[PDB]
Design a protein around this ligand. Structure first.
Ligand SMILES: [Zn+2]
Ligand SMILES: [Zn+2]
Ligand SMILES: [Zn+2]
Ligand SMILES: [Zn+2]
Lengths: 585, 187, 585
RNA sequence: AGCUGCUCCCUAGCAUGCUACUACCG
RNA sequence: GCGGUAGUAGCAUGCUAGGGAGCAG
């Protein structure tokens, strides 16, 4: 027992029927339970009538019957209503202030997190209430994700190709590269240890963790975690230092980090670093640059996935002596180039999923778009450093949301730090980019790139443009273009030097079937971070908003040192982004 | 009680009584109305105060019935548990040695203390220190109770396996030292 | 204590004066107690006046007496009637919805199961009420079968011939081949272990179990069981697969089973196999055909009697390897060609009477005609496999009913599955038969054989038929024709090659006596299953409905590869079925 | 994880008893 | 005016029951 969230007074009650059973005071809980449909409260004992085999679970109908709570037809001669006076009988009934404006918590509870206003309230509410919204999001997605089917493989067709069989009553969720499956191997006693995999249609193509034998009867299931409550908020109430505290500047100047010397002082006197950095503007070069700002300082690496800490690592093998550094991995498939099970050190690479509890000096965050309110806050919830960096930008895709069907989340309300670049403003950016020719910078600036970025090296006049509409026949959550992959069929072979490029499609089924005629490597822009290639191909597929919005293009256009093909179907960003247009074969 | 026959009589009696009081007719009218509402509250007393012992007694009976049903279910549960235990422990003693030593008795009666001594297939020895180990369970096979047993598996007080090559006189001070030997009866 | 059958709500009361004391709710119990004359209810204690040596057992005249229930003349000053408000005082008096239409269970309770409407309600009612009706039928038969006399043998005349004596007050039942006797041998302490025997008039002829000495004073009694309640219904709510689940088709085709290939897929996607199959159309050949459809499958063989599992076995010595196979026999005389006391295997043959509890894949049912609502449901009450076979047909005789004296049971209401071939339709049948020439196929089709079947090989023109009337003088339940066995006397010797045939009669007394002039083996069509012979004789005897009807005639005619004799007395099926007719000598 | 004996505190029930107030009647 | 019976409220003694705790052999 303890204090409540909305009210901060000590209480002993819960919403039984609500999601994550928060602490709520007498009048506090009364408002929450009378304004909406949660009508089950838990004290040290639950509020139910102990009548043998009775049914009722309401709160406003049960009464007191001496030692216990009883039903109306069950109650003794004279009683005392448990729910009166505008209060529910509980601990600390006097020191309770309550509240009037309860529409916030009521909406957050009764919501299903399906539409845009859901997240509008999730951010625009109280910060503790937004932590609660984060945990409610996690619980809802966990409950909805195990509710799908079980992959009961029965055949063995080939390697990376099998046949699927699923049970009655549960549909089969979108076999995407977004949500990883999880399987266990059968035996007479138990069934365990196959790992996490990723399936899609083929015959069924599977993406396996590590090579082994494919047995019969093994199930592949989207398993869930045991998510836990949060302690610290998203970020700290912020501050500007009077001095360079716990820090002292360097003595020399670094060639690769001469472009960021103006970025050293500006955050050495505050906690956070509000980054506005497009993919490939020296995004991670400062993660090793500001690292050697003072090698005695304790820098904390975070990552969205193991691929993010790999991009944070794939250049740490040259400038960083490995005398004392490590990365955290719990008891899979990834780079492990540093120490394992070493935590308190000079440099700690880490994915937020298994970060230990310590205190340090620097915190080099990994791209902020993927982070929601939950996982960004986990860092300061376990490791409370007292000045930060927030590498990343809402300029790219976030971590996707499963049942977001009505109008998709806006490019402002990703998470907490995300909003104050267009509410207070940014301080962080490199005036130089790293891949982009003139085609990928200036016209992209009229987008949410703020009319801010120049080109690295000058124009190539080589990124292609199309003029068509496309014909589509779509599967359960995927859609392939017979003609629009037939139009690129003419562009590829008739431009013989064009095929060092990787064609990407967010409907990876397109990349599944395009390898049958062309064989180019498959890739989706879901994990377009880390991929940095010279020639790239892209298409529009459907002209609907699953890919048409700003954050869905700009992960794919900003890729090339030379050029990218863009097969257009719609006219919005066809009129927005301009490239060289030619004749249609 | 709210809808029993006495209620209508009492209510209408007092309604007419107080309507006539608002009329204020006589001096015997007050006496008569007050006597009516004395004897009509003498109906709402027996029918609304002693009618409620019936319900309380019925509830006594209902709670007793619930208690008896629960106590009757627990008995069946424990009966099943006991007979399952008996039958499961039966399936280990019906060997051919037991039949032999029972058919060698003159009445079918034997002392119980000799049943494990002559029919058990596995022996367990608990040893306090090294000298006792050297006197009883030395080597790989030993003799006891007019039989010969062969060793398999040795553990210590922590239930951790010990190899037969570690039980020496020099390595003795490094062992948790009750030792438990398990042996099998040799044919 | 638990839920009631009509209501599925928890209760604690019994219909005491009623047959099988089913669970009934408060309102349920009041309807059943006031609509008809069972007026004795059992709570956790009985509703009986505890006055010393009282006699009252009624429910509505007993009153409460404080701790106990007390009689009117013995009740305390103030009591509380146990049966008012439309309810009986019991547990869970609130959560009980009751029912209004109680005529069904009332009629099922008060009936004696002697006429046709009995079984009409036993079928057309609720399926759980069909379970209850099956148990009620079984209980009525068990109490009526022991109520007959005791066979007190006191003589020793010869072997298979003795003399009977029965006590006063009990008649001796029909000495039939439908109900088996049971004897126990006398000794000074107890009397046990003679076995099951079958008697009839001689002198008294006996069909003995196994050879032994016939002692003096031994009784032979129609001993009853101690039958138990049921759990599972007749059949599972049905379903068609989207795949071949729990199965995988074979690779080759079989010569013996190429006539059934079209029947492989048709139930490979559902549970039950409702079969319309005339006797001997490949009736059991598919049982070994579908068995090796997939030899890894778990196939459950049921049996009607050990003769049925023998007909299942009498062909399994060749196509089946005995590497892992068994049949069940509890602690007698029959074939036991496989493992004994082996249950969970590749194949287990079994008679439902002693089937254990496991889970399997295939269940090959033996002919459904005998099976009642009870016995067919027993199999899935103990072994719940999840696709089934229902080999059998209402085309033949069922197991007889003892006191079925009024209107005989109709050929549609045998059991559950037997109704939906002329209510929904049948799916299984072999378009080939195995013995029948032209005389026993096409004309039989105008009967309940659906105009569906052809001949195996063509006409023989050898089946015989007569034109007479018959004269009968009958015993207790038997009837012998002195003249009509005298007219076949002229047919036999004057056709010298006729005497390979066996003469059949439902009144085996005819076959008992015809052996005194002819000596041919005795046989009745009570167990005409398994008997498949070249030459057969039959006669009509009395023209009544005991043998003239559809399932009573057709059980005997479908027998010969060449021909059978047909001695008719009535003209219904003389005009219905036509054969070779000649002059009467 | 046992068999007894003694003591303190809280709750509920019933009987008995005391005392007080209303009603009927004599 | 008194006695009785039927009611309502408070107090007292003990008797059973349930729960927590302490000591001794
Ligand atoms: Zn709530
Ligand atoms: Zn209740
Ligand atoms: Zn009844
Ligand atoms: Zn009585």
């Amino acid at each position: 027992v303890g204090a409540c969230v909305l009210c901060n007074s000590q209480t002993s009650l819960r919403c039984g029927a609500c999601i994550r059973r928060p602490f709520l005071c007498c009048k506090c809980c009364y408002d929450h339970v009378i304004s909406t449909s949660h009508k089950l409260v838990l004290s040290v004992n639950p509020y139910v009538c102990n009548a043998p085999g009775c049914d009722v679970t309401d709160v406003t109908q049960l009464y007191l019957g001496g030692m216990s709570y009883y039903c109306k037809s069950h109650k003794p001669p004279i009683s005392f209503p448990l729910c009166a006076n505008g209060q529910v009988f509980g601990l600390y009934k006097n020191t309770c202030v309550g509240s009037d404006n309860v529409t916030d918590f009521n909406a957050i509870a009764t919501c299903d997190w399906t539409n845009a206003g859901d997240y509008i309230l999730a951010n625009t509410c109280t910060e503790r209430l937004k932590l609660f919204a984060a945990e409610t999001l996690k619980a809802t997605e966990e409950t909805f994700k195990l509710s799908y089917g079980i992959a009961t493989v029965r055949e063995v067709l080939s390697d990376r190709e099998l046949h699927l069989s699923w049970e009655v009553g549960k549909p089969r969720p979108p076999l995407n590269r977004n949500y990883v499956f999880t399987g266990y191997r059968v035996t007479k006693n138990s069934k365990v240890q196959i790992g996490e995999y990723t399936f899609e249609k083929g015959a069924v193509v599977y993406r396996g963790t590590t090579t082994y034998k494919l047995n019969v009867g093994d199930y592949f299931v989207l398993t869930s975690h045991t998510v836990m409550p949060l302690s610290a908020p998203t970020l700290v109430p912020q501050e500007h230092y009077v001095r360079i505290t716990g820090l002292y500047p360097t003595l020399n100047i670094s060639d690769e980090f001469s472009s960021n010397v103006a970025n050293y002082q500006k955050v050495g006197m505050q906690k956070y670093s509000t980054l506005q950095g497009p993919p490939g503007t020296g995004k991670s070069h400062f993660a090793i640059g500001l690292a050697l700002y003072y090698p005695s300082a304790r820098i904390v690496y975070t990552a969205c996935s193991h691929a993010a800490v790999d991009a944070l690592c794939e250049k740490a093998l040259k400038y960083l002596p490995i005398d004392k550094c490590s990365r955290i991995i719990p008891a899979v498939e990834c780079f492990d180039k540093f120490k394992v099970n070493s935590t308190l050190e000079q440099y700690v690479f880490c994915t937020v999923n298994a970060l230990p509890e310590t205190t340090a000096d620097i915190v080099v965050f990994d791209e902020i778009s993927m982070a929601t309110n939950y996982d960004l806050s986990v860092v300061n919830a376990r490791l409370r450093a007292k000045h930060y960096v927030y590498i990343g930008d809402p300029a790219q895709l976030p971590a996707p949301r499963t049942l977001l069907t009505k109008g998709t989340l806006e490019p402002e309300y990703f998470n907490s730090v995300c909003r104050l670049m267009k509410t207070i403003g940014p301080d962080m950016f490199l005036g130089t980019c790293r891949r982009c020719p003139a085609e990928i910078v200036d016209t992209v600036s009229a987008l949410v790139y703020d009319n801010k970025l120049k080109a690295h090296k000058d124009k190539s006049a080589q990124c292609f443009k199309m003029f068509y509409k496309g014909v589509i026949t779509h599967d359960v959550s995927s859609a392939i273009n017979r003609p629009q992959i037939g139009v690129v069929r003419e562009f590829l072979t008739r431009n013989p030097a064009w095929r060092k490029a990787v064609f990407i499609s967010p409907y990876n089924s397109q990349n599944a079937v395009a390898s049958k005629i062309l064989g180019l490597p498959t890739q989706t822009v879901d994990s377009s971070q880390g991929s940095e290639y010279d020639y790239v191909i892209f298409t529009q597929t459907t002209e609907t908003a699953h890919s048409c919005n700003v954050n869905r293009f700009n992960v794919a256009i900003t890729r090339a040192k030379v050029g990218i093909l863009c097969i257009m179907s719609d006219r919005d960003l066809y009129d927005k982004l301009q490239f060289t247009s030619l004749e249609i074969p | 009680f709210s809808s029993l026959p006495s209620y209508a009589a009492f209510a209408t009696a007092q309604e007419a009584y107080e309507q006539a009081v608002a009329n204020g007719d006589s001096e015997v009218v007050l006496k008569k109305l007050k006597k009516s509402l004395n004897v009509a509250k003498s109906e709402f007393d027996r029918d609304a105060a002693m009618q409620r012992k019936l319900e309380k007694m019925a509830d006594q009976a209902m709670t007793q019935m619930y208690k008896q049903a629960r106590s009757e279910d627990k008995r069946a549960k424990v009966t099943s548990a006991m007979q399952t235990m008996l039958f499961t422990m039966l399936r280990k003693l019906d060997n051919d040695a037991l039949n032999n030593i029972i058919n060698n008795a003159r009445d079918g009666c034997v002392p119980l203390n000799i049943i494990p001594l002559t029919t058990a297939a596995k022996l367990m020895v608990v040893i306090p220190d090294y000298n006792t180990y050297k006197n009883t369970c030395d080597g790989t096979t030993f003799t006891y109770a007019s039989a010969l047993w062969e060793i398999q598996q040795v553990v210590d007080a922590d239930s951790k396996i010990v190899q037969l090559s570690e039980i020496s006189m020099d390595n003795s001070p490094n062992l948790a030292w009750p030792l438990i030997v398990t042996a099998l009866r040799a044919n």
